[PDB]
Design a protein around this ligand. Structure first.
Ligand SMILES: [Mg+2]
Ligand SMILES: [Mg+2]
Ligand SMILES: [Mg+2]
Ligand SMILES: [Mg+2]
Ligand SMILES: [Mg+2]
Ligand SMILES: [Mg+2]
Ligand SMILES: [Mg+2]
Ligand SMILES: [Mg+2]
Ligand SMILES: [Mg+2]
Ligand SMILES: [Mg+2]
Ligand SMILES: [Mg+2]
Ligand SMILES: [Mg+2]
Ligand SMILES: [Mg+2]
Ligand SMILES: [Mg+2]
Ligand SMILES: [Mg+2]
Ligand SMILES: [Mg+2]
Ligand SMILES: [Mg+2]
Ligand SMILES: [Mg+2]
Ligand SMILES: [Mg+2]
Ligand SMILES: [Mg+2]
Ligand SMILES: [Mg+2]
Ligand SMILES: [Mg+2]
Ligand SMILES: [Mg+2]
Lengths: 77, 132, 101, 138, 257, 328, 194, 49, 538
RNA sequence: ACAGGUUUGG
RNA sequence: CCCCGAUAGACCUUACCAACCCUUGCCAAUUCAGCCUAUAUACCGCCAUCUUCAGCAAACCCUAAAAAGGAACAAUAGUAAGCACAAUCAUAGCACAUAAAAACGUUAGGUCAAGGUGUAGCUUAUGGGUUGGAAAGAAAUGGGCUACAUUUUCUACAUAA
């Protein structure tokens, strides 16, 4: 009573693949981020807004540290 | 020797209440608990919050009604509203008793974000159970 | 005031951990995996070492709320073994009674 | 002799939405002592026989949580004080409930719940079938 | 820091150390000065440090027929109230530091010869208002107990008398000195002698008696020889009514004999 | 305290009427079994001691027997034995001795006239009569009692019962007699049941050391046991557990005369063997006469085994084994 | 000036209705209860303490507002809110063929200021597989698709969802799982032929 | 928050609604100590002055 | 109130004072909550109740002159500096900013209003809808209605229609002033009522509630247009509120004294409004029952008082009376009719549910309850009312004690009612001689309560306490008690009576000295007959 | 001597 | 007393030390905060031991004086409230057993370091923060686990290999 979770539904919590478009599909970034999305899908304590800054923090960190991803030998965007 | 919650026997002239005349090993046998809530159940939570709130109510009422409190408070907790049952001596006039109850009924409510009830039973003197 | 200076330090440690909870979570997400190449993991280790000391949840000490005892406390009531007895013997704790069996 | 007149003014509407159905409604009330649970069981069964719900009552096994603490303050470990927390359970099984009947029952049940007991309400909601399973082919 | 506080009852119980383990056997008595002060004696529940005047506690509820709002005293008025509050403290400490007065029976630091008041009334309702009593001897008697050891018990000898010839004596023994005093006052009336006084001032003849080991020689005297006797025999005869007597105690001078 | 109890009785009657009004029962038929029942519901106190619960009874059971006044307004006592301390007990002893002397003189005159019309009316064994206890005498005589005077009164009562009894003496000596529960430990025998066209079907329940065992017995089949769906040979590989199964059957010589199916749970192998032993023994009572079930209970088949593991005590090892106590 | 007022007991009528003085849960004021009740352990020569100043009668929860007359009078006015249960479902044999979907929903109550209980998000779905339109291949694929969530003895599929924060979200997600588990069981892929 | 409870109860004691016997006992003992003559020295003159 | 007897209110002033003390503690606690908000900012309840959160008195923005006023208008004296601090920087105020500022003066707040009225008009061309709502409602309380009729002419000229609330105050601003003329001032209201419909604004309930608020003070014969307006209230389709009937019943009470024919119009108007369920939608509904039941209490009508009570207990038993003064004035004159009209059984039945439960009566109902027993000869209930009147009318005891004991001189004293005449006569004598003027008539009653009771001992000791009080009664008491001394054969009493009675020059001493001669012969006290003659001569 | 203090767990 | 405070030490815990910083320095205010500084030989709160021993004890009464003692059941000065013992309660039926309880006092017994504290001492320091270290065993000893096997060891397994 009194908690609506911003009026969100289950398709805003369980399905988080629509936020992984700014990431390499065949690289290890997908292998790693699919795990954080599987965790955020089974995290009932976080909101649909709170998961977004998590995936955005990863989007920002990986796009900020570009030299190590290119010197690691595997290509990533 | 056991000394917890135990008033030592004097020469035979001290007045003691029914709650003090019984050792702590008599709780739930001859005397009951001064507070009732659900946090102390098996699969329940939020127990320490109720313990600290109860101890704050005790230490607050001991200062709010000085020297005129007969015995300990009865803190009943039932459905989001907390009732406080007190036994008070008829040392203060009702004009001040009503001021105090009306002040606490709103101070505790605004401090604990929950409805509180305050009930006072005034006695002529401290009820003696054992030797006096 | 508080009960003790060490409790005043522990509440500050808990506030610092509550402030740096998410950053350490996202940094540990980069170390507790094997998919990422090992090059960035050392930089993540230096990033997590550059964080303030009182930020890790390992520095918190579950002391008593009444007397701030670092040991002999129960997690359910957050009370030391002495204050818990002092409140249970007076009948001020519901459902608690002396075990006789 | 001074009885008020026209004291009943309820606001009850009947919405066109189909009322929800319930197969089995279990109420598990837990407490510390047995007397309050017994009087509350008597009160609940007398409140259910009037609305005609045919409640069934049984007593689940109790749970005793015991622990051991030190008796003295500084150093005495051979002498301990053992504390105990008894938890008694009472099960009220209601069958063939409706959406508003269960509401009017839990209204008179929960508003009158004692202070030292708690209540676990398990509802078995009744449904026929969702829309995409009636007769679909992909 | 608010939950670390206790009640004034336990604070005084921990401060005065009345139930200490050292003052039990007799190691104390060095600093025999114990005084407990009640802190809520002249503490009005309405007044405070800020000087707020609440309509329900400090000031009356209705003034001029209207309601009273939350008001606050001025600084000089609060200084006047705190000056009265501080003055009450020394007013009470003056009544505390002053010792009430005692009457010395035989010397300044003895109980022999001091007045103990009329004895307590009987159960049937008889009141002894004309009776006066005097303590003759107080002695701390000790007994050897198995557990505690030396068991000090005060034994008191008290004599009652009205001044018309009726007088008696008794011994009261108790753990407390006032309890022994009462046990001897209420027990001395049950053993009352009647002393024949010639002309109500002297005895009829010179008596020379020999008790267990005490020799008493008392001689009849005229109206001008007023109570030239032992310091306790003078008190006993002053309780009896004998105004003229000469007594000489030889041998043992035991008070009871 | 003669008036206080009188006022408490009026207040209790008003409380009884009010209780019947709020409970909704007719106040005329409202009895104590409804008073305590309404108190247990209105004030549901959960406490282990029964005397600490809320109770509302007539004041004559709550308040103890108060002593009546002993002297009038002029001070003269009423009874002639008031200056003896125990004016009720000594008066009872005086009346008993006065009736003993009356029986003695009447029997002497009857022996002088050579007439024997009295009988022995002291043997009350088939009735089950006993003497009053000290508490039962302290309830009749309001004043306190001791041991020596009670034994003296009993020894005078037997002296009075050892003589030729009169008419009014027997009704006086009877009022100090108490009738003793049933002195019979004979267990209840279950009747033979017939379920689903099956003859000679009985059931028994046993429990020993946290092991519950229910055994059904058919007296028309051959000798074999089926426990938890598997035979007893594969369920009890040890010969001792199967000897526990042979114990109750060999005692009645019904080895190859009964089929049995058991359901045991909890405990270990010997605890299960003892639970099924007790259940089979309690279930075989229906198929046997009354003389042999008594031999079973005198041989230890129908009685439980209260030997349960004791709880470990704090500061010890095995609830008896103490720690190594160092002298120095 | 001290004043001592006698209680209502001297004014309480013998036929006065009881629910009028105790409408709701009350702290058992001894001045408004005309019943003389003695509660407490007695003294060897004394009696249990009276109701006046008795903390024992104040510790226990009183049921003076739930007497049989008051509960009958309360439910007689509550009979207007409920609806009548259709007698067409008296036995569960017809309830299984009419409403084969069962939704187990949990609800808790606890004394305190907070209401959020993390066990409230749990929604259980129970569907009997003998009431669907599964074919042989669809059923034999759905069994291995669910795994241990479906039992063979009772033949009931159970869905245990706890990932969503809200109970309505967990319900909608359980129905979504039921829809996808019924749909994807009919699609035969290329790796099924081996 | 122990500071909330402490400041609330102390402000209520200064306003005249709560009566803290523990703090009153502390003030009584401190007053008698300062009247005896051993009080609290000023910050900056304990060691030097 | 607290259910404990030590806190239960005894009298009505106590019932008022206990609630006022409790509200004083509520507001004292709320003052602490508002003064120290940081001690309550921590929220523990999940639903986040706003009612228990502290309220803030400070404005958020102080530098911005536009943002500084919207916060201060809602929270008197500080609001006055906001307009000056905004105009110090020559900030342009819109038509929506200063309207609430003028309303903040028109709600709270004679020359400062003019200094504020020049600033709303001279500074900016404000909209008249935000002009009249402040000026008309502010200048009405300042006793200066001349400005409304000046502003109305500019309002009608600015081509803007007048809202419904403007005529709610213009008819008052026109009517309150009367200088030897009434017809013109009543005609102006008809002109404004006729122009209301021409302005295409439907007048709500308040205009037809205020025309009857204006027709009350001036003319008592103005009932004709009041009834016509009450008949026009029913044609449009809106129901008239309770105060609308109250303003009719008040003037009908003003016209009911010289002619009782108008009371039937008061009687047949309530029968149609009692037939439906009402609701307090008009804040002036507090005087309605105060006027509707005072007419029945004045005209002595109980059959209609039963229906004016049923109209109270029909819809809302408590939401129609605001202050306790009118409730206390209500139940006193309600009980004033139930005593002598209807029977004693129903009066005593309505006594125990009204007096100790709802409210305690004043000094007036005590006299009616006393007039209720002596007409029907009810003596078994006199002590029950007496013991209640101690705790109910203890303040008025010194003015009702002369009338509470007089009834015993009119009825008979049965031989069974002696202890009720004894205990009540002892409990009144135990209090006055221990502290309070004592009336002399109560001795004439206490001498007849003990006459038929056969108790002359306790009856004689009382008179010695009055004759020593330096006040002497009439000789009828002495002559009556002489018959008791004659029947008890006690001659030593009249010899101590007449020797202290003849010394103070009583008018019937010639009768007392004759009545003693007849008792001396039957007592055979002829020796003491002439003994007092010698003392009366000496 | 009108005496008092002082031996001892007492 | 010796797997005892501690049902519990990498930083924190930690009160210890070395280097460095701050001194109305947690609180609304306070010539004030704060001290794990000394005193358990000033204490309260909690316990150990006699101790599963039954005695302690208010109010009285008696003794050819009384420091103290107070009993004879075919009875010789003893009545005695109360606290202990006992009974009851708990280990969901009794009985048993266990658990619990065990007064007044002895050991100035343990605990200023659960917490507050009387007295005496610190206040640019015996107070408050950060970093780094608090080893190691020449040796003795208490309590436990593992064994020193054949009634043993390994494997599958209820115990017939
Ligand atoms: Mg500290
Ligand atoms: Mg840790
Ligand atoms: Mg001297
Ligand atoms: Mg000498
Ligand atoms: Mg072992
Ligand atoms: Mg010697
Ligand atoms: Mg460090
Ligand atoms: Mg360390
Ligand atoms: Mg330090
Ligand atoms: Mg010690
Ligand atoms: Mg004994
Ligand atoms: Mg003796
Ligand atoms: Mg005794
Ligand atoms: Mg039992
Ligand atoms: Mg036993
Ligand atoms: Mg034990
Ligand atoms: Mg015992
Ligand atoms: Mg020591
Ligand atoms: Mg030490
Ligand atoms: Mg300390
Ligand atoms: Mg130390
Ligand atoms: Mg070693
Ligand atoms: Mg050990």
């Amino acid at each position: 009573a009194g908690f609506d979770d911003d009026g969100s539904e289950f398709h805003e919590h369980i399905f988080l693949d629509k936020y992984l478009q700014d990431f390499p599909k065949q690289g290890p970034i997908r292998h790693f981020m699919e795990l954080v999305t599987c965790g955020l899908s089974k995290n009932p304590y976080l909101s649909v807004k709170q998961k977004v800054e998590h995936i955005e923090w990863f989007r920002n960190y990986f796009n900020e540290k570009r030299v190590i991803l290119k010197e690691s030998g595997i290509q990533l965007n | 020797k056991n000394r917890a919650a135990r008033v030592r026997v004097s020469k035979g002239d001290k007045p003691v209440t029914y709650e003090e005349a019984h050792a702590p090993h008599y709780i739930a046998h001859r005397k009951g608990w001064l507070s009732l809530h659900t946090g102390n159940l098996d699969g329940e939570d939020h127990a320490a919050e109720r313990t600290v709130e109860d101890v704050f109510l005790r230490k607050f009422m001991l200062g709010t009604f000085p020297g005129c409190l007969a015995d300990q408070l009865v803190l009943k907790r039932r459905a989001n509203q907390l009732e406080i049952c007190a036994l008070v001596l008829r040392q203060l006039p009702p004009h001040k008793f009503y001021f105090l109850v009306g002040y606490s009924e709103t101070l505790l409510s605004h401090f604990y974000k929950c409805p509180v009830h305050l009930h006072l039973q005034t006695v002529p003197s401290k009820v003696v159970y054992k030797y006096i | 005031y508080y009960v003790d200076w060490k409790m005043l330090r522990d509440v500050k440690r808990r506030k610092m951990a509550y402030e740096y909870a998410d950053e350490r979570l996202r940094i540990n997400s980069l170390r507790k995996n094997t998919i990422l190449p090992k090059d960035l993991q050392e930089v993540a280790d230096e990033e997590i070492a550059s964080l303030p000391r009182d930020s890790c949840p390992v520095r918190i000490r579950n002391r008593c709320v009444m007397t701030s005892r670092p040991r002999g406390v129960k997690r359910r009531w957050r009370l030391s073994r002495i204050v818990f007895r002092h409140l249970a013997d007076h009948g001020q704790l519901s459902g608690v009674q002396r075990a006789m069996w | 002799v001074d009885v008020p007149k026209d004291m009943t003014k309820p606001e009850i509407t009947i919405s066109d939405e189909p009322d929800t159905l319930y197969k089995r409604l279990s109420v598990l009330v837990k407490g510390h002592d047995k007397a309050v649970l017994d009087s509350y069981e008597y009160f609940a069964v007398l409140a259910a026989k009037e609305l005609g719900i045919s409640i069934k009552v049984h007593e689940p096994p109790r749970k005793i949580e015991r622990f051991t603490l030190l008796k003295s303050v500084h150093i005495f470990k051979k002498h301990r004080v053992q504390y105990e927390m008894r938890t008694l359970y009472r099960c009220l099984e209601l069958e063939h409930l409706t959406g508003s009947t269960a509401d009017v029952y839990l209204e008179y049940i929960q508003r009158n719940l004692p202070e030292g007991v708690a209540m676990e309400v398990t509802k078995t909601k009744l449904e026929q079938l969702p829309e995409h399973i009636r007769k679909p082919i992909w | 820091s608010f939950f670390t506080k206790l009640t004034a009852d336990e604070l005084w119980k921990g401060a005065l150390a009345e139930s200490g383990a050292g003052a039990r056997k007799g190691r104390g008595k060095r600093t025999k000065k114990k005084r407990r002060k009640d802190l809520n004696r002249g503490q009005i529940i309405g007044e405070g440090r800020h000087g707020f005047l609440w309509p329900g506690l400090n000031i009356p509820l209705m003034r001029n027929g209207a309601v009273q709002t939350i008001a606050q005293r001025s600084k000089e008025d609060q200084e006047k109230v705190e000056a009265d509050m501080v003055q009450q403290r020394e007013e009470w400490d003056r009544r505390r530091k002053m010792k009430v007065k005692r009457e010395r029976g035989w010397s300044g630091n003895t109980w022999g010869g001091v007045s103990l008041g009329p004895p307590d009334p009987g159960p049937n309702g008889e009141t002894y208002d004309d009776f006066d009593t005097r303590i003759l001897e107080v002695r701390n008697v000790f007994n050897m107990t198995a557990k505690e050891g030396r068991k000090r018990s005060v034994r008191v000898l008290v004599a009652v008398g009205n001044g018309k010839g009726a007088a008696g004596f008794a011994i009261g023994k108790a753990t407390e000195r006032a309890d022994a005093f009462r046990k001897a006052k209420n027990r001395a009336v049950h053993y009352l002698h009647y002393i024949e006084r010639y002309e109500d001032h002297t005895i009829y003849h010179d008596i020379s008696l020999k008790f267990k080991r005490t020799h008493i020689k008392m001689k009849k005297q005229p109206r001008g020889y007023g109570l030239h006797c032992h310091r306790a025999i003078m008190t006993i005869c002053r309780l009896i009514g004998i105004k003229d007597l000469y007594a000489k105690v030889s041998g043992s001078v035991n008070m009871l004999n | 305290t003669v008036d206080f109890i009188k006022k408490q009785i009026e207040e209790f009657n008003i409380g009884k009427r009010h209780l019947a009004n709020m409970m909704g029962e007719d106040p005329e038929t409202f009895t104590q079994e409804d008073i305590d029942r309404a108190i247990a519901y209105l004030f549901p106190s959960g406490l282990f001691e029964k005397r600490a619960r809320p109770i509302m009874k007539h004041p004559e059971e709550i308040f103890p027997k108060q002593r009546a006044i002993q002297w009038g307004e002029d001070g003269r006592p009423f009874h002639f034995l008031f200056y003896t301390g125990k004016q009720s007990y000594y008066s009872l002893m005086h009346d008993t001795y006065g009736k003993l002397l009356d029986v003695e003189k009447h029997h002497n005159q009857l022996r002088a006239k050579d007439l024997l019309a009295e009988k022995t009316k002291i043997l009350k064994d088939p009735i089950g009569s006993r003497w009053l206890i000290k508490e039962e005498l302290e309830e009749m005589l309001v004043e306190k009692l001791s041991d020596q005077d009670y034994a003296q009164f009993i020894r005078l009562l037997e002296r009075l019962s050892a003589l030729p009894c009169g008419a009014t003496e027997e009704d006086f000596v009877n009022r100090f007699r108490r009738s003793i529960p049933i002195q019979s430990k004979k267990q209840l025998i279950e009747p033979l049941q017939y379920d689903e066209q099956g003859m000679a079907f009985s059931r028994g329940e046993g429990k020993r050391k946290t092991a519950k065992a229910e055994v059904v017995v058919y007296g028309q089949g051959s000798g074999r046991i089926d426990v938890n769906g598997v035979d007893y040979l594969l369920y009890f590989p040890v010969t001792q557990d199967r000897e526990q199964l042979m114990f109750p059957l060999h005692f009645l010589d019904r080895l190859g005369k009964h089929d049995m199916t058991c359901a045991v749970s909890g405990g270990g192998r010997s605890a299960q063997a003892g639970a099924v032993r007790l259940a089979m023994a309690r279930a075989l009572c229906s198929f046997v006469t009354e003389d042999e079930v008594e031999w079973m209970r005198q041989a230890g088949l129908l009685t439980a085994d209260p030997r349960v593991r004791e709880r470990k005590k704090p500061g010890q090892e095995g609830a008896r084994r103490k720690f190594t106590w160092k002298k120095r | 000036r001290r004043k001592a007022l006698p209680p209502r007991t001297e004014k309480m009528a013998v036929d006065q209705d009881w629910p009028s003085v105790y409408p709701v849960a009350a702290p058992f004021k001894p001045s408004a209860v005309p019943l003389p009740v003695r509660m407490g352990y007695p003294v060897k020569r004394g009696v249990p303490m009276a109701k006046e100043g008795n903390l024992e009668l104040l510790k226990i929860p009183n049921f003076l507002h739930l007497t049989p007359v008051a509960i009958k009078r309360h439910c007689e006015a509550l009979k207007d809110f409920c609806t009548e249960w259709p007698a067409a479902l008296d036995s569960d044999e017809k309830c299984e063929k009419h409403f084969p979907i069962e939704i187990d929903t949990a609800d808790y109550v606890s004394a305190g200021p907070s209401i959020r209980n993390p066990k409230a998000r749990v929604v259980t779905l129970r569907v009997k597989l003998s009431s669907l339109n599964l074919d042989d291949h669809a059923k034999k694929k759905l069994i291995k698709l669910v795994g241990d969530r479906y039992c063979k003895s009772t033949d009931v599929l159970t869905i245990k969802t706890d990932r969503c924060p809200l109970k309505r979200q967990n319900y909608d997600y359980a129905v979504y799982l039921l829809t996808v588990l019924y749909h994807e069981s009919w699609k035969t892929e290329e790796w099924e032929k081996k | 928050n122990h500071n909330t409870y402490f400041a609330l109860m102390g402000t209520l004691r200064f306003l005249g609604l709560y009566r803290d016997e523990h703090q009153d006992f502390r003030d009584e003992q401190l007053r008698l100590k300062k009247l005896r003559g051993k009080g609290k020295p000023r910050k900056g003159e304990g060691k030097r002055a | 109130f607290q259910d404990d007897p030590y806190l239960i209110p005894t009298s009505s002033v106590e019932s008022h004072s206990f609630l006022l003390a409790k509200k004083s503690g509520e507001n004292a606690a709320k003052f602490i909550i508002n003064s120290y908000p940081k001690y309550f900012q921590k929220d523990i309840a999940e639903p986040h109740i706003p009612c228990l959160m502290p309220e803030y008195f400070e404005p958020q923005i102080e530098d911005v002159s536009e943002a500084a006023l919207q916060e201060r208008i809602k929270l008197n004296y500080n609001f006055q500096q906001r307009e000056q601090s905004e105009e110090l920087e020559e900030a342009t105020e819109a038509d929506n900013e200063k309207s609430k500022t003028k309303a903040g003066h028109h709600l709270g707040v004679t020359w400062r209003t003019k200094n504020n009225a020049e600033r709303i008009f001279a500074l900016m061309p404000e909209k008249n809808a935000h002009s009249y709502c402040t000026m008309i409602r502010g200048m009405v309380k300042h006793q200066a209605p001349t400005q409304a009729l000046n502003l109305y002419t500019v309002l009608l000229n600015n081509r803007l229609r007048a809202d419904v609330y403007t005529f709610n105050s213009l008819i008052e601003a026109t009517a309150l002033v009367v200088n030897e003329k009434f017809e013109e001032k009543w005609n102006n209201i008809l002109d404004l009522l006729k122009q209301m419909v021409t302005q295409n604004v439907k007048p709500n309930l308040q205009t037809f509630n205020t025309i009857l608020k204006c027709l009350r003070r001036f003319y008592a014969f103005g009932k004709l247009p009041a009834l016509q307006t009450l008949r026009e209230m029913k044609a449009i389709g809106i129901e008239p509120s309770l105060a609308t009937y109250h303003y009719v019943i008040q003037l009908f009470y003003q016209h009911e004294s010289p002619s009782k024919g108008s009371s039937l119009i008061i009687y047949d108007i309530m029968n149609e409004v009692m037939g439906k369920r009402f609701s307090p939608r008009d804040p002036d509904d507090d005087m309605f029952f105060q006027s509707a039941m005072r007419v029945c209490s004045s005209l002595r009508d109980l059959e209609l008082a039963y229906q004016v009570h049923g109209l109270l207990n029909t819809g809302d038993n408590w939401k129609l009376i605001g202050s306790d003064h009118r409730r206390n004035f209500y139940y006193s004159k309600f009980f004033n009719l139930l005593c002598f009209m209807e029977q004693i059984d129903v009066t005593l039945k309505w006594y125990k549910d009204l007096i100790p439960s709802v409210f305690f009566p004043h000094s007036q109902t005590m006299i009616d309850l006393l007039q209720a027993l002596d007409v029907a000869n009810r003596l078994d209930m006199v002590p029950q009312i007496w013991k209640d009147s101690k705790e109910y009318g203890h303040t008025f005891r010194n003015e009702l004690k002369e009338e509470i004991l007089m009834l015993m001189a009119r009825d008979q004293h049965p031989p069974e009612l002696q202890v009720a005449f004894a205990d009540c006569a002892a409990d009144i004598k135990s209090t006055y001689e221990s502290q309070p003027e004592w009336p002399a008539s109560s001795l004439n009653y206490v001498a007849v309560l003990f006459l038929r009771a056969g108790r002359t001992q306790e009856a004689w000791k009382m008179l010695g306490l009055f004759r020593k009080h330096n006040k002497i009664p009439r000789a009828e008491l002495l002559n009556e008690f002489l018959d008791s001394a004659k029947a008890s054969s006690s001659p030593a009493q009249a010899i101590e009576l007449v020797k202290l009675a003849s010394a103070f020059s009583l008018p019937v001493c010639e009768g007392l000295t004759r009545r003693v001669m007849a008792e001396f012969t039957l007592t055979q006290e002829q020796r003491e007959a002439l003994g007092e003659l010698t003392a009366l001569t000496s």
